[PDB]
């Protein structure tokens, strides 16, 4: 309450680097009591957002960030029951040139937040953190939820790739400490988006024809996305990001010749 | 061979950004093929770093480093069978003020890397890649060899905190690339240095008189290492990395007081 207020403050700071690991991991015990009021702890991260400041603005929406991924789901949940999120669409702060130019990317990274609680609004689940492989969700859905739910994860990273940093851009401890939880996103979320491609093509012969039409369009606009994930992950390697977190890219791109089925 | 040396010289090209995922990956397949000659490949290494440029030598340190933790073991099993390794402790590029303040970053990576092979040879494993745990031998070590092997991760845990590097000194790709690796290995080499300390302790009251003694000391310079761990953690945490990535220190420095069972 009080305890997670004063919490909250010194996660959001002035000083520029991102939120300390040390008030990080207690709010993400935070979200782990049954006894803590959610809707309190956001309101008041909310709050910071309404700051003049670019600092304050961007490590409260860093901080959200990195509970959405560390908190308990109860944390995403409450966010995405919610009608009205982050509405940072004009910010502008002033003051200084770092300002004027970190203001746009809050503008980007703020989008891509409210995005992924409309997306687990939608679904149900966090493409993020759902079972791999070949017993797990993406690859085990029938086909009519499938056809659903691709688009979604499509559309989320879509709003991801808007953040379009480049590497000589990424130039203070706050923006980088945003980019570094946009990489993890966008690791898993690709691995999520391949996997459910690969039940597409698994299923898009014995399937409706009107299906296989919807179906031609997702694979359609997934090989175009491949070429924007390949961008983004050299602006990775870029900047040093170690190669072996990296994926590898050489999977499920040459089978366009589906697009006669339509025979 | 000819394909070895060519993907040699391109992960160490001039261009100032660590080496590219594709060369890196060819390069870690090589150490794995039991037809290729390891020597010739290390040799190729070595070669790169009499050139007069910091960028292709940091970069030949840089891809060494990288086999020495994603390749097969048996890549420093030869580096540790050598008798001389790398010899760049009077290495300075005067070309620009780039290479003026790199030089004496290559100057301290490349004496990481030295003890890093010197270690392995002393004690037949990596202490990065071993069973962690309880059922893992940092843990399970008999009073003999602890006595003997925490001392050389304490030497290696030296040269690795001796890069000494600030947050507004990781200006560009290449000088990053080196510190992700050495985050890497830091995080690694802390908990098993820190399991052996579990162990030390398990067995401290059990043990001869002289030995108690021995013991006392390595407590006592592991107390000093865990600041300066922090202060380099600290430094990770200014640059963005990942919170969640960042291990929690706040485990075994209380007991100082079995500097009186030598009742
Ligand atoms: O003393 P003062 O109040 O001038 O500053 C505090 C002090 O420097 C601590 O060392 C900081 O904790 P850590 O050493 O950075 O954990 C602490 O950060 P936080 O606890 O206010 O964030 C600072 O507030
Ligand atoms: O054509 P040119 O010879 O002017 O340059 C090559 C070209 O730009 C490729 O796209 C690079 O591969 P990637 O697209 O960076 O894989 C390649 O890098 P590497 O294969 O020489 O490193 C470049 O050499």
């Given at each position: 309450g009080s305890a997670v207020s004063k919490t909250v403050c010194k996660a959001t700071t002035?000083?520029?680097?991102?939120?300390k690991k040390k008030h990080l991991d207690y709010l993400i015990q935070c979200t782990n009591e049954?006894?803590?009021?959610i809707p309190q702890l956001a309101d008041s991260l909310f709050e910071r957002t309404t700051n003049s400041s670019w600092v304050v603005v961007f490590k409260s929406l860093i901080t959200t960030h990195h509970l959405m991924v560390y908190g308990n789901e109860r944390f995403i949940q409450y966010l995405a029951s919610?009608?009205?999120?982050?509405?940072?669409?004009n910010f502008l702060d002033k003051s200084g040139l770092q300002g004027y130019d970190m203001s746009t990317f809050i503008r980007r990274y703020s989008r891509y937040l409210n995005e992924k609680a409309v997306s687990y609004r939608q679904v149900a689940f966090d493409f993020t953190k759902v079972k791999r492989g070949a017993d797990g969700v993406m690859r085990t859905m029938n086909t009519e939820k499938l056809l659903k739910t691709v688009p979604i994860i499509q559309n989320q990273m879509d709003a991801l790739l808007?953040?379009?940093?480049?590497?000589?851009?990424?130039?203070?401890g706050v923006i980088n400490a945003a980019f570094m939880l946009l990489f993890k996103d966008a690791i898993r979320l690709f691995a999520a988006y391949n996997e459910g491609i690969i039940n597409l093509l698994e299923k898009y012969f014995d399937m409706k024809k009107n299906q296989c039409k919807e179906g031609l369009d997702i694979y359609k606009k997934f090989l175009t996305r491949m070429t924007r994930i390949s961008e983004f992950l050299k602006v990775a390697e870029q900047v040093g990001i170690d190669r072996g977190d990296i994926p590898d890219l050489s999977q499920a791109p040459s089978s366009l010749l589906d697009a006669l089925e339509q025979h």
């Open positions: 002035h000083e520029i680097m991102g939120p049954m006894n803590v009021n919610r009608n009205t999120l982050f509405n940072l669409s808007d953040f379009n940093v480049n590497s000589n851009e990424l130039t203070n």
